């Protein structure tokens, strides 16, 4: 199913989405370079607890259109605004994973929370990944992220292998918490995403969300793995909880960046306990 | 890389140029007697901000051919027109520094702004540097510029030393805002330019741009240093600000003429804020 969010030359930019269940609407917004199907273990848990689950694929990923324009959080948040207005959701919960935590913060900042009852940030980007003079809490200088973009442009298909090795801490989790088959499925999803988005999306990772955070005026959850090699907990979740002290806060012991799958039970128990309130 | 702009006897006239990054095209047009490389501090900032940066070396300067013909703003603007058509640049921003502010105004005036989104004038020549009866705001009468031509023809290599002393306000900035090594690099660039262009270019500095200014019909930025010893702000930017009151206007307190280097942080902040609109 698709929702049109804009036009690109002679084509419409359509985002693939699904809408399941009945109950309070929970919108799940996936990370790079996957799709709304990456939430399958959380979608199953939410459906089992009587929620309505809505998922969509960010432009350039999954089954959505693959434009060569719009890779920036104002456009990503305008796409989410179109989704939410089209579905006319009320009392909705927005749950972001990694890149999706940017859509949540920028959307609440720019459009407000009239349709929103709660937000959850899992494996967050916030507050601002660049290590700069004005942001000493950042994870790394911009040249580090520039090198990731260059590696995608050199051969995205080979880049995905090393990417998922650190995304899922495969040296620790392959064969225990994640099978070789589930990693292969992630690689297939990544390769199905657009070539342009694959290399342009990482330039948005280090967006500065510090001015968006004070506008988060609904109940919030921040959750992160202590073994996240991709987005270090010290420069993301721990600093984000200082910036958003009203949020509930959970650290999942030993979990990697790809904790929706490897630590599904720990994510699902924490997310449903938060949504029950 | 080179773009051919014409023929001189048995030779072609080729302008050196570079084309980096991706996104909205930003064309940077340098001043005398330097080259596209003099924008390195701005180029780095624009590339990091997601723009496509195009630089070229004016005929007779940098690594471009050194003809003994064409030192006038109609030719200079026709050279820019060839660069823009050769590259098919569209929705482009034109940024001039000092002599480059002549290309920007003369191009927009003669050719119009179908290809151009915005224009920026840094350390401008405009509106008309010659002091006359009809133009009392000019900086100096023709004899001053005839004296500069004659000094360049007498020994251009020695001329560059005192010229850069005033350009960068070295009595204030040497060893703080500009190193002796960076000044030496500027002298080397100047010595690499053509002998003929070195002495022909000063006659063009007092071109009258008063009829070109009313033809600027896209958003504009005018920025100048208040300590400019080369192009006094009271004969240039402050007069220009009255002739084009709709332009964003920035005075960089205490900055010299060579503010792309000495006050790069201020220039980059103003330029990126202007381009983000």
Swiss-Prot record, chains A, B:
The keyword Lyase does not apply. Pfam families: Abhydrolase_1 (PF00561). InterPro entries: AB_hydrolase, AB_hydrolase_1, AB_hydrolase_fold, Epox_hydrolase-like. Homodimer. PANTHER family: HYDROLASE, ALPHA/BETA FOLD FAMILY PROTEIN, NON-HEME CHLOROPEROXIDASE-RELATED. Coiled coil: none annotated. Gene3D superfamilies: alpha/beta hydrolase. Residues 25-263 form the AB hydrolase-1 domain. This is Non-heme chloroperoxidase. One of its GO terms (molecular function) is chloride peroxidase activity. Its EC number is 1.11.1.-. Signal peptide: none annotated. The keyword Oxidoreductase applies. Keywords: Chloride, Oxidoreductase, Peroxidase. Belongs to the AB hydrolase superfamily. Bacterial non-heme haloperoxidase / perhydrolase family. The active site is at 98, 228, 257. It is an enzyme of class 1 (oxidoreductase).
């Amino acid at each position: 199913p698709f929702i049109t969010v804009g036009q690109e030359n002679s084509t419409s930019i359509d985002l693939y989405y699904e809408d399941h269940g009945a109950g309070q609407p929970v919108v799940l917004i996936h990370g790079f370079p996957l799709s709304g199907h990456s939430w399958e273990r959380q979608s199953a848990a939410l459906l089992d607890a009587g929620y309505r689950v809505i998922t969509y694929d960010r432009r350039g990923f999954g089954q959505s259109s693959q434009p060569t324009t719009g890779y920036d959080y104002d456009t990503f948040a305008a796409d989410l605004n179109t989704v939410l207005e089209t579905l006319d959701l009320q009392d909705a919960v927005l749950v972001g994973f990694s890149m999706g935590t940017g859509e949540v913060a920028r959307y609440v900042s720019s459009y407000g929370t009239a349709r929103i009852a709660k937000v959850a940030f899992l494996a967050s980007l916030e507050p601002f990944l660049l290590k700069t003079d004005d942001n000493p809490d950042g994870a790394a200088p911009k040249e580090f992220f520039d090198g990731i973009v260059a590696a995608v442009k050199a051969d995205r298909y080979a880049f995905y292998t090393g990417f998922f090795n650190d995304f899922y801490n495969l040296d620790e989790n392959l064969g225990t918490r994640i099978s070789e088959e589930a990693v292969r499925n992630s690689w297939n999803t990544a390769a199905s995403g657009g070539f342009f988005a694959a290399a342009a999306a990482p330039t948005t990772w280090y967006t500065d969300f510090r001015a968006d955070i004070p506008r988060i005026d609904v109940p919030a959850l921040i959750l992160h793995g202590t073994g996240d090699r991709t987005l270090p907990i010290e420069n993301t979740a721990r600093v984000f909880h200082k910036a958003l002290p009203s949020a509930e806060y959970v650290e999942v012991e030993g979990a990697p960046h790809g904790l929706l799958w490897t630590h599904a039970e720990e994510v699902n128990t924490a997310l449903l306990a938060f949504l029950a309130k």
